[PDB]
Amino acid sequence: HHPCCSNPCQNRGECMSTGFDQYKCDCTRTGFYGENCTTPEFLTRIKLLLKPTPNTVHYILTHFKGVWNIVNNIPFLRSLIMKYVLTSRSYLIDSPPTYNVHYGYKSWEAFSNLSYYTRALPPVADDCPTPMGVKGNKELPDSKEVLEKVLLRREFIPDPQGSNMMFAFFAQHFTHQFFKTDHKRGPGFTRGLGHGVDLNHIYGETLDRQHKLRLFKDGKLKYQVIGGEVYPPTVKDTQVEMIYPPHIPENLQFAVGQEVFGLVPGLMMYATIWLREHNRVCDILKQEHPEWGDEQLFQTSRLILIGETIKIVIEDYVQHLSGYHFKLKFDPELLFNQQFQYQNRIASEFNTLYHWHPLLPDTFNIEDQEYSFKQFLYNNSILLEHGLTQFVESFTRQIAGRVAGGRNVPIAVQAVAKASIDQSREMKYQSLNEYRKRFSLKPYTSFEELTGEKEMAAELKALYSDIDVMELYPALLVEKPRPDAIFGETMVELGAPFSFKGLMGNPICSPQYWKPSTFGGEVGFKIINTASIQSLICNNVKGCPFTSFNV
Amino acid sequence: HHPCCSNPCQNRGECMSTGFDQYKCDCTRTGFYGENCTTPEFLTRIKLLLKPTPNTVHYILTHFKGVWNIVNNIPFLRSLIMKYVLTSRSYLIDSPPTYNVHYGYKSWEAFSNLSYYTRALPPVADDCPTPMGVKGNKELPDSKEVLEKVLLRREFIPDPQGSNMMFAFFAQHFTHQFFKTDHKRGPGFTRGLGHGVDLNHIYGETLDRQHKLRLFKDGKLKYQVIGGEVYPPTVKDTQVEMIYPPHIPENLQFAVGQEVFGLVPGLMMYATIWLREHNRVCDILKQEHPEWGDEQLFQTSRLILIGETIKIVIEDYVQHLSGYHFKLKFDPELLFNQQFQYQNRIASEFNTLYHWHPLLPDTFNIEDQEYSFKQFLYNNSILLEHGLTQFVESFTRQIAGRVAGGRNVPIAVQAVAKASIDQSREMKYQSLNEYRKRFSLKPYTSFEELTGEKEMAAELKALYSDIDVMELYPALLVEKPRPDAIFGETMVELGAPFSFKGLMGNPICSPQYWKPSTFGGEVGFKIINTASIQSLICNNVKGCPFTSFNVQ
């Protein structure tokens, strides 16, 4: 079998076979040397002794509110701190991208083929004696057993950080522009060839699909008006393929950028909000530029909406998730003096970690109604009956479920949760602790240390036997959360690098794009730099209801 | 008409319409302010006072040969100079890329659509009152008149720098991996979706083509043996589509990565050399890794060959071309402490400036024979008859034409030269002087200053009237060359930025790829760092004939 099965190279060393049963480690630029890149250089010794742990930093960022208030109101310090956040996080990501499901060594095929998700760690070789390499049993524990013992919800565990349904559907809507798995090809393949925040979930992945969705007047998107209210246009009207059960009434077959968005009325809420926003921006730009044509109005609006999305994601969405007293900032200018690659490739593991199915409530509570999953799935009727105002008001009030801490996956989505385990096994994922080491974390030494608890830990110990073969996805959902937090350490420490890299790595953040002229002048530039989730809803929802990502 | 037609914004300022009759210039990070970004900031004033002109820097690099001999032997100093050559040139390129033929403003379509060539300068708007904007006549001069008066070869003018036929065909072979115009769509569109040095002209653009060219044993490419010599396989054997006229027999239909390489035996020469190199590297890698399979051997060989190619392009090809006494260096590590984007998008203007048709000779001289264009085109029998050794020996000593200086396009490719002018106009290119300002060069004030001469200058003046409506491509071919040199100023100052961006921007040059293990260990890595045109030929051509890019 492959000599690198045991994962012998440490500290980001590269393993290469040199014979049938011999390997070598390439310690180039790791700060380490020796056979396995474990002997630190003198400079690395001092860097290690002085580096605070992720949990220490977390404690500082979530405490001393009085100091942060001062720091937040001095732009020089705010910028300084945000600059460090962006750079230190992004440095953990290979960019240009490296491995994928089929390639555990660098290759031109792996670099150039955009159909693959990329990989932060190379897959376990096909001939390895063990699923995780050399450690553990000949098979991983049964998929269903792990799910039932440790993942499935008994009683609803609300998020202590206060995340609501506005946050939960935003997460789903937003991420489904870059997590679009090509199930025809396999779990390691993507249909999102733009690999980032391109807004294909609004505009369509292809030019053919985009042009069917456009009005070709004033830069706007097609729409229908039901009950005086503006909604996405119809499948029949546009000839835009969508996924719908055969029984859905013609006029509730809404056509939007992303094919799967008719599945959940919560996604159509955001789909409707964003379509209105685009046409609102068209109106603004037509005012500033009576001379512009349909095409330029459309493209400029799209760039503006990308900017708005990135702004909201950092300053409202990640801000909420973090729990920090420090106010995160969206400012491309922070990187203009830094080394940074304005490109992104979506990683399979980033897809895997974002399976936040525990966020889902037991029922979806609109106005006086409480809908079960069966009633809510594929029911755009609910959206038309209640309206966007009521949707926002209700979902702002409804608490979401806790992700870490264990046992909070709703049984309605049990098949999806199991699929996450099975597919990551098909894609030969390395172990939790291998991923922790990859992102500068200390490997867990026991199951009890993972869960901060005894019962689930005991169950897991019987199932996996060795902590060093525990699986990434299940561990993320059972991990001891931070104090009164939605996530545990591994979720934050892996997720933040991928996230900031996808956000800042956008062409619009690059110096030749980050100018008012790109967005139609100061007016369009202002729309981006003052965007918020509140103003998104205020501008596009009748009655301007209060909203936020917390209850 | 569009308010920005007159290109009012200077120094990289971006023009935006603010009404039917009005514009605004965005001067962000240009170092200038004011209505048209022409009022310099204080720091900018100092920088402009102490900045040498491209001409004086060229002088320094082409003189003081003894000084440069010392400099070339001081690793620290060589690194410092080479580092500045890379950075100062690269900042002239937009990366991520901006405009294209359909988009004079920034847009997601322009950014994300790999089928377009990008544009260093936005096209002239569709409703502008003149082709160049506001200046000059309603119509440009007849391109046939321009071609005939100042472009067409009278007597052959040899290159003073001594470029040979090895250099001319290497240029053609190398660049045709990334200049692959999509004629079914138009001249602003490409088929090279990799936009750089991916070696698709060897391995194929798509995975289907690659798999048909591969042997699936030992990482190797399919081949055939003719008279004990290794050549590419046939169309019949691979089912690989190639462009060949009907009269070409089955056995002479060689199949290579790039569809058009059957056109020219000089191209098929390099195709055969590089196929041999691939299979040679596979042999070496199998010796180091008897445990590896076919797929890893193929892929790792591809990565090494990409390395070899960049190494050769910088240290042999650009070196010869530059005329410098300073030794250029391929070293990715020079950029590791620098702000640099490891990505590339091929620019339409880079394609246009690379139409070096004056390089071509009147006849192709192999051993005893002198083949006309008609006898040479599509005639791979010439290659089998003489062999690679005689091809290398013959092309090494045959001189190429001078590109700049006028009247040196061979009449055989008359139609191709005219097409370069026509297509430029079709793609709504801005004027020569606009492109010069775009690259920090002084605009020419007269046709005489452009040509350094009187006869062609006056003909051009009668055709164009105004120096500010002179077109880019004709100007490059008529421009006053540097002393005893192949190119004029505009060719080098536009060409170099596009070039180093394409070479260093390649993912293998990035810190995570530039490691011995990417290339299968220290042996594989050393193949890259010791690669040269001579060694490529020595290892792959029987007898190891001597070669270089100059006649000597």
Ligand code: COH
């Ligand atoms: C954080 C947002 C979020 C939530 C709340 C969520 C909870 C829900 C939910 C309840 C309303 C429904 C009806 C769905 C339905 C689906 N989810 Co999500 N999943 C979410 C983010 C994801 C991710 C991540 C994937 C995997 C990527 C993929 O398959 O495209 C996913 C995939 C899907 C798929 C494709 C099948 C597969 O193989 O994964 C279906 C169907 N969906 N999930």
Ligand code: COH
């Ligand atoms: C620098 C290398 C080089 C040389 C020596 C060269 C000299 C020669 C030559 C002598 C052997 C032959 C037979 C050809 C034949 C052709 N050249 Co070149 N051209 C070259 C680089 C180009 C470029 C640049 C173009 C523009 C279009 C493209 O490459 O897609 C070109 C285009 C072509 C085309 C049609 C494509 C188009 O213009 O759209 C033909 C036919 N060829 N040319």
Ligand SMILES: *[C@@H]1O[C@H](CO)[C@@H](O[C@@H]2O[C@H](CO)[C@@H](O[C@H]3O[C@H](CO)[C@@H](O)[C@H](O)[C@@H]3O)[C@H](O)[C@H]2NC(C)=O)[C@H](O)[C@H]1NC(C)=O
């Ligand atoms: C990058 O831009 C290319 C040029 O715009 C584009 O190719 C174009 O695609 C359009 C729309 O798909 C094609 O137009 C089609 O229109 C109707 C659809 O009903 C059909 O009847 C026609 O057969 C036709 O295919 C054009 O053919 C084509 N335009 C060209 C070649 O100039 C690419 O699609 C873009 N690339 C991506 C990835 O989006």
Ligand SMILES: *[C@@H]1O[C@@H](CO)[C@@H](O[C@@H]2O[C@H](CO)[C@@H](O)[C@H](O)[C@H]2NC(C)=O)[C@H](O)[C@H]1NC(C)=O
């Ligand atoms: C910056 O813009 C240019 C536009 O090219 C210039 O406008 C020109 O000024 C001429 C007089 O110097 C006028 O005849 C005419 O209005 C205009 N020319 C053309 C061809 O449109 C502005 O003067 C200049 N502004 C500044 C402040 O320098």
Ligand SMILES: *[C@@H]1O[C@H](CO)[C@@H](O[C@@H]2O[C@H](CO)[C@@H](O)[C@H](O)[C@H]2NC(C)=O)[C@H](O)[C@H]1NC(C)=O
């Ligand atoms: C580098 O790593 C290898 C493998 O991880 C180490 O070799 C193993 O060490 C353990 C000691 O706990 C033994 O049980 C194994 O049998 C050893 N051999 C193999 C082939 O796995 C090696 O010691 C490390 N080298 C250094 C210098 O630290």
Ligand SMILES: *[C@@H]1O[C@H](CO)[C@@H](O[C@@H]2O[C@H](CO)[C@@H](O)[C@H](O)[C@H]2NC(C)=O)[C@H](O)[C@H]1NC(C)=O
């Ligand atoms: C990217 O990779 C995929 C998978 O390797 C390629 O799809 C394969 O293409 C071959 C030959 O074209 C088919 O025989 C296989 O069935 C495909 N594999 C699948 C569908 O999983 C794909 O062609 C590559 N993309 C590009 C642009 O080269």
Ligand SMILES: CCCCC/C=C\C/C=C\C/C=C\C/C=C\CCCC(=O)O
């Ligand atoms: C591909 C484009 C990327 C878009 C970004 C998508 C999602 C961002 C949100 C969550 C990512 C997952 C975990 C990060 C959790 C908290 C962030 C705060 C940590 C920090 O700030 O230190």
Ligand SMILES: CCCCC/C=C\C/C=C\C/C=C\C/C=C\CCCC(=O)O
């Ligand atoms: C994808 C791009 C690949 C690179 C293109 C390959 C070769 C470029 C060769 C010539 C380009 C035009 C003019 C001359 C360029 C450099 C000469 C020395 C100038 C310098 O060094 O200061």
Ligand SMILES: CCCCCCCCO[C@@H]1O[C@H](CO)[C@@H](O)[C@H](O)[C@H]1O
């Ligand atoms: C409500 C749906 C959840 C079904 C899970 C039951 C199957 C897994 O068995 C679990 O064993 C655990 C031992 O620690 C018990 O604490 C759980 O109650 C039990 O569910």
Ligand SMILES: CCCCCCCCO[C@@H]1O[C@H](CO)[C@@H](O)[C@H](O)[C@H]1O
């Ligand atoms: C041999 C010296 C070249 C003279 C320069 C050409 C001047 C115009 O010669 C033109 O070029 C072509 C050449 O066959 C012909 O097709 C045109 O009919 C002819 O007008």
Ligand SMILES: *[C@@H]1O[C@H](CO)[C@@H](O)[C@H](O)[C@H]1NC(C)=O
């Ligand atoms: C559809 O949703 C509506 C709410 O308007 C509800 O009355 C109905 O029962 C739902 N239908 C199904 C099949 O769930």
Ligand SMILES: *[C@@H]1O[C@H](CO)[C@@H](O)[C@H](O)[C@H]1NC(C)=O
């Ligand atoms: C092709 O070249 C061969 C030499 O190998 C020569 O004999 C023949 O005449 C040429 N064919 C044509 C059509 O010019």
